[PDB]
Amino acid sequence: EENAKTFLNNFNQEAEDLSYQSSLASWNYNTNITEENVQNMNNAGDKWSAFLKEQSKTAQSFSLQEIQTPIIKRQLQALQQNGSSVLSEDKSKRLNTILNTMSTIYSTGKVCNPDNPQECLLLEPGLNEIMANSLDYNERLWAWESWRSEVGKQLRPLYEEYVVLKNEMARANHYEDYGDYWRGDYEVNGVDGYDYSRGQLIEDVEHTFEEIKPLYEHLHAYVRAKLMNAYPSYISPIGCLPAHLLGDMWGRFWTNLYSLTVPFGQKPNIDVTDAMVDQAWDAQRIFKEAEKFFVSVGLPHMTQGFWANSMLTEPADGRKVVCHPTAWDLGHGDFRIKMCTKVTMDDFLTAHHEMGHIQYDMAYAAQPFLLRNGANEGFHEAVGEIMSLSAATPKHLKSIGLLSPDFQEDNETEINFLLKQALTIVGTLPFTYMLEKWRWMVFKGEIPKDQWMKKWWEMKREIVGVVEPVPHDETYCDPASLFHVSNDYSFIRYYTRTLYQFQFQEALCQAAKHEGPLHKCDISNSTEAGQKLFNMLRLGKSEPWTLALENVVGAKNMNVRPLLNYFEPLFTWLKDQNKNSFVGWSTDWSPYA
Amino acid sequence: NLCPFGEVFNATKFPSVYAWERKKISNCVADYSVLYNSTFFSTFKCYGVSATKLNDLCFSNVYADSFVVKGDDVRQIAPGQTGVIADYNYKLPDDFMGCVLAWNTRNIDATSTGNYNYKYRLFRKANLKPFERDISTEIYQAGSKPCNGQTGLNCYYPLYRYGFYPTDGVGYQPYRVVVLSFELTVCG
Numbered sequence: 046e047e048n049a050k051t052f053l054n055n056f057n058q059e060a061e062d063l064s065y066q067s068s069l070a071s072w073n074y075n076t077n078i079t080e081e082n083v084q085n086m087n088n089a090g091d092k093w094s095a096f097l098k099e100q101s102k103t104a105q106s107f108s109l110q111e112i113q114t115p116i117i118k119r120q121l122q123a124l125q126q127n128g129s130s131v132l133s134e135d136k137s138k139r140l141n142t143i144l145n146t147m148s149t150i151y152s153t154g155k156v157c158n159p160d161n162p163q164e165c166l167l168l169e170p171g172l173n174e175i176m177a178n179s180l181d182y183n184e185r186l187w188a189w190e191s192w193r194s195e196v197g198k199q200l201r202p203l204y205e206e207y208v209v210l211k212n213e214m215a216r217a218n219h220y221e222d223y224g225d226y227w228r229g230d231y232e233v234n235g236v237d238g239y240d241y242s243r244g245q246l247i248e249d250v251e252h253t254f255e256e257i258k259p260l261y262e263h264l265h266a267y268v269r270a271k272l273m274n275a276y277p278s279y280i281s282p283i284g285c286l287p288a289h290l291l292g293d294m295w296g297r298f299w300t301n302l303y304s305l306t307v308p309f310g311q312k313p314n315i316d317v318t319d320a321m322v323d324q325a326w327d328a329q330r331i332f333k334e335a336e337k338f339f340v341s342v343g344l345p346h347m348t349q350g351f352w353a354n355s356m357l358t359e360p361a362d363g364r365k366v367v368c369h370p371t372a373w374d375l376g377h378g379d380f381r382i383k384m385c386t387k388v389t390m391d392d393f394l395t396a397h398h399e400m401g402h403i404q405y406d407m408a409y410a411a412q413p414f415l416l417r418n419g420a421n422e423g424f425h426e427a428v429g430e431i432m433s434l435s436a437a438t439p440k441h442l443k444s445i446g447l448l449s450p451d452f453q454e455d456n457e458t459e460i461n462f463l464l465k466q467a468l469t470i471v472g473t474l475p476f477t478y479m480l481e482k483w484r485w486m487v488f489k490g491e492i493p494k495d496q497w498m499k500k501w502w503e504m505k506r507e508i509v510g511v512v513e514p515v516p517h518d519e520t521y522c523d524p525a526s527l528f529h530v531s532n533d534y535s536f537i538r539y540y541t542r543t544l545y546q547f548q549f550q551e552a553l554c555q556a557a558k559h560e561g562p563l564h565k566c567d568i569s570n571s572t573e574a575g576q577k578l579f580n581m582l583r584l585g586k587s588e589p590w591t592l593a594l595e596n597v598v599g600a601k602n603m604n605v606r607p608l609l610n611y612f613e614p615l616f617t618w619l620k621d622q623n624k625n626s627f628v629g630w631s632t633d634w635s636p637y638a
Numbered sequence: 639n640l641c642p643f644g645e646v647f648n649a650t651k652f653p654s655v656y657a658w659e660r661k662k663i664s665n666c667v668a669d670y671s672v673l674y675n676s677t678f679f680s681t682f683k684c685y686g687v688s689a690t691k692l693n694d695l696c697f698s699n700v701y702a703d704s705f706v707v708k709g710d711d712v713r714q715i716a717p718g719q720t721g722v723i724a725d726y727n728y729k730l731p732d733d734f735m736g737c738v739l740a741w742n743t744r745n746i747d748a749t750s751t752g753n754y755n756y757k758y759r760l761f762r763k764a765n766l767k768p769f770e771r772d773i774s775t776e777i778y779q780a781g782s783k784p785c786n787g788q789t790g791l792n793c794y795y796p797l798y799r800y801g802f803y804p805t806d807g808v809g810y811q812p813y814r815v816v817v818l819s820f821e822l823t824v825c826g
């Protein structure tokens with residue numbers, strides 16, 4: 046039995062060194078894009094990649110059932126996975142090549158305007174600006190279609206081989222398909238009453254989705270009525286919503302629709318972006334002020350190596366940087382944040398999400414290397430959101446000094462706030478399920494490749510209530526038009542993390558002894574509730590996610606009740622507005638016919 | 639004459655924790671004023687005797703044990719610890735009588751490419767006795783039959799390297815530790 050105990054102590058000391066060679070090399074690329082750094086980010090990771098496979102096979106010789114201490118059982122299963130090297134020699138390189146070819150044409154994808162051929166825009170910030178601010182139905186129709194017809198159709202032949210090759214990877218790893226490969230994240234095979242099946246994931250997300258439909262169907266009817274004023278004669282009062290009028294490229298978030306669907310736009314806006322500029326704030330002031338939020342609840346400060354090795358601003362003066370905000374846990378106590386912070390309220394709240402990732406990383410640092418990870422794929426993104434939920438409340442903005450102390454918090458300002466939160470939180474729930482349900486069936490083989498796009502839009506209207514503006518045959522690849530689909534990223538984590546972020550908030554505000562509504566809770570000054578989250582952040586990947594969730598919320602599974610209580614004042618207000626409107630949508634209307 | 643404490647503290651090269659060296663202090667007066675009137679040490683943790691009584695005290699002989707561990711392995715140089723450094727590299731007796739001084743040396747012991755000179759023992763059958771020293775590189779046989787001098791499956795090398803980097807966190811930065819043991823000729 047001790048034979049496996051020394052094996053892990055050999056891995057946990059040698060993997061940390063190799064995982065720091067790759068983690069430090071990956072930072073040198075995202076902070077200094079150079080063709081030379083492409084090799085260092087790759088080669089230092091390939092040596093690490095060749096190490097995990099040699100140790101996964103050596104750990105696989107150990108009899109898994111012949112363990113007795115629980116800390117060692119869970120460490121071996123993290124290495125018991127076969128991985129992706131079960132594929133053939135030549136098919137492993139072609140499958141790895143199409144992943145790059147899909148990831149490149151997603152970023153290199155540029156479309157040119159027929160009215161102005163010299164102007165050719167990219168996805169960011171070219172097409173995304175048109176989908177996020179333009180009000181021309183035809184201009185939004187072009188950017189939506191040109192992305193799916195010029196760069197989406199290029200992903201179609203690659204994605205057909207992407208599915209057939211990665212299914213072979215999963216079917217050889219004792220899985221049913223690549224869709225089953227991703228559902229193994231929530232799988233638990235251990236303590237009595239804490240186990241969880243891979244197929245149970247499908248049953249739970251569908252069961253908890255039914256309590257979301259009453260709230261979402263009223264948001265859909267309210268947004269459609271407001272959108273009928275912005276785009277008249279283009280929207281049916283009973284039909285679905287056009288895909289290009291949802292606020293972004295794919296209709297994932299309806300956040301940009303707040304300028305069109307605001308309940309009481311006459312009141313002063315809560316975007317405190319202007320107040321940050323006239324106070325001479327920089328990226329230092331934002332992260333330093335965010336540091337004060339974590340220290341107020343008992344959590345440690347940001348280490349000096351963080352303030353000295355993190356990229357808090359756009360580099361400038363001679364460098365290239367992937368400006369996507371990411372929180373990095375390189376190991377060896379090295380914690381950094383790579384983000385091109387602007388002097389805006391959106392980047393002010395993003396610093397609270399990304400530093401929330403670091404606080405989780407700093408907590409489980411005592412866990413072994415194999416156990417240093419979130420409870421599940423959605424636990425990390427839920428920890429970052431509960432930080433931004435408390436930081437976005439007016440009581441927190443006024444206490445920091447950004448909002449005016451005489452800001453009137455009427456019952457109408459809370460409806461405007463809950464409506465803005467609904468356009469981002471509850472608006473993405475049907476889109477996330479329908480997207481992952483499509484890939485779950487495509488991997489399952491229920492959707493043949495000669496009708497991938499027919500069933501994709503048949504679920505857009507049924508699940509999300511969204512209609513395509515122009516008909517699409519099978520040459521299109523609208524699913525892969527999103528980042529997570531064309532870059533091999535699971536998407537169900539964004540659905541589970543949303544329900545996790547409200548079970549955490551309700552459980553933490555009860556420990557913080559909050560009294561008002563859930564949307565007015567600020568967990569600042571709460572060293573009592575800060576220890577309650579500390580108890581689960583230190584857990585890491587040791588105990589199953591069912592147990593880590595139970596340590597804070599007291600439940601073994603996800604629950605939709607906290608989310609509905611957060612939007613309860615808005616849900617009652619949406620049912621009042623839609624009394625003379627039509628709640629629901631017809632899956633047969635289309636903007637062409 | 640005074641005791642040469644500079645030959646162990648301000649020493650140029652420090653040994654690994656598994657091969658820590660010991661130096662005997664004989665007939666000489668000890669100068670604890672420089673150690674006390676200096677914030678250069680990061681810990682300065684004493685056991686058995688207080689930090690202010692040894693000034694006007696006499697001992698039979700004093701021993702200084704110098705080595706280097708990581709930041710998190712400094713807390714294991716204390717009586718009653720069960721870490722890797724305590725069990726397999728350097729164990730202090732429960733009746734220890736002396737002080738343990740440490741200070742951060744990332745500026746000298748951590749190069750850009752990582753300084754892998756400092757090592758530590760990771761595998762050893764049974765734990766180390768108090769003040770015991772083991773510098774054997776014999777191949778550690780884990781489970782069944784031995785290894786015939788050859789490493790492999792269930793056959794691991796006993797020693798492993800630290801490799802301190804400048805970007806390492808404060809708990810992964812190198813620290814030079816000096817353990818001053820008082821055994822009951824060396825007054826103050």
Ligand SMILES: *[C@@H]1O[C@H](CO)[C@@H](O[C@@H]2O[C@H](CO)[C@@H](O)[C@H](O)[C@H]2NC(C)=O)[C@H](O)[C@H]1NC(C)=O
Pocket residue numbers: 341441443444445569570
């Ligand atoms: C709790 O956190 C709040 C911020 O949310 C702190 O409130 C500010 O504290 C500073 C320093 O004392 C004052 O200058 C501000 O006027 C306070 N703003 C308020 C009260 O809105 C507070 O100090 C923290 N600690 C305690 C014990 O409340």
Ligand SMILES: *[C@@H]1O[C@H](CO)[C@@H](O)[C@H](O)[C@H]1NC(C)=O
Pocket residue numbers: 077079080081082363364
């Ligand atoms: C970026 O990396 C290259 C090598 O890939 C190096 O020569 C250059 O100095 C680096 N620049 C900065 C600003 O770090």
Ligand SMILES: [Cl-]
Pocket residue numbers: 288295296523524
């Ligand atoms: Cl879409």
Ligand SMILES: [Zn+2]
Pocket residue numbers: 398399402425426429
């Ligand atoms: Zn995140």
